Design a protein around this ligand. Sequence first.
Ligand SMILES: O=C(O)C(=O)Cc1ccc(O)cc1
Length: 359
Amino acid sequence: ETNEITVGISVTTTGPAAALGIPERNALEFVVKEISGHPIKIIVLDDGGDPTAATTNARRFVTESKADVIMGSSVTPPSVAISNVANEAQIPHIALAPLPITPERAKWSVVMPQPIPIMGKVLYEHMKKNNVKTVGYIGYSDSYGDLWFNDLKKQGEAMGLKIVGEERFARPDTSVAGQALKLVAANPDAILVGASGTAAALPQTTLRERGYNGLIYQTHGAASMDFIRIAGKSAEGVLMASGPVMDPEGQDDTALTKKPGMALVKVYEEKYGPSSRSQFAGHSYDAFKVLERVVPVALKKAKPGTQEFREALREAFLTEKDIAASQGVYNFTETDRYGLDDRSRILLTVKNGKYVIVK
Ligand SMILES: O=C(O)C(=O)Cc1ccc(O)cc1
């Protein structure tokens, strides 16, 4: 009847990715604190973006906290680390960063952020519409950057785009001077930046300061105010993939995403200020929207704090259809662990220091 549901959350609230995990943690103020008469005990720990710390946190959630579900992390490397733990421990995991889904990961993990090909397709279509022919890339030297570069090669080239340079940088790097000078020399019509948070603004500002005049495209990893704050004037004209949480006011009342998105941005921005909404707050909030749907189904089969409950939650991801959330409408399957479609994305630009939808 009333025993607790335990949710362990590992997110990044210090280090280079704090811009993503802070909103994710903050959003927890606004999610339900009990479901179907069972109080939720949330245990939240910082991982610093570090896979080793995220592994530690997930392991202790399972063995010590007896968690029913684990969530996190804020960026791809720790999210991989948690999925690996979850799939060994046999515990549902809701990831808050895109990650590469492999056989080892697919059974127990689902993914809130939009998959990279959905977001790439919106960017590449705008490139084509706008007579862009040549494209350069600068992104992380890790799995997130690889996911993006592979997509640009596979989808972008399929659609006639020509890739004329690729540069990588590491997450903590404070300069991309050299990479930027190679891309400026190459002078593509557009450059795709495969990065997130504060690091996404680094190529933005560097490319402009080094004289780049083409179009710059940013991933959904960039979709918060921090980008505009840091990049300043250099952010003007940027094209950015984003989930729909960035603009619920603009959605049709028929959109399933409108009410949850309006509910989140209103309460979040009441607390944290005008335009404080972010992609990342959306993910955290939406993980609880998925839990509101799957928990009552699992409860019919088992009590919280048992392995049977973890199993029942896993099966419920597969049976509960059209989970409406701020970022999209979720339909998970055995092979699609993201579960999202075109209702899960919009295209933004920046005009006079504010995000504006691109139609
Ligand atoms: O930096 C990384 O590894 C990311 O995975 C960033 C990220 C987090 C959430 C998103 O919706 C999009 C991108």
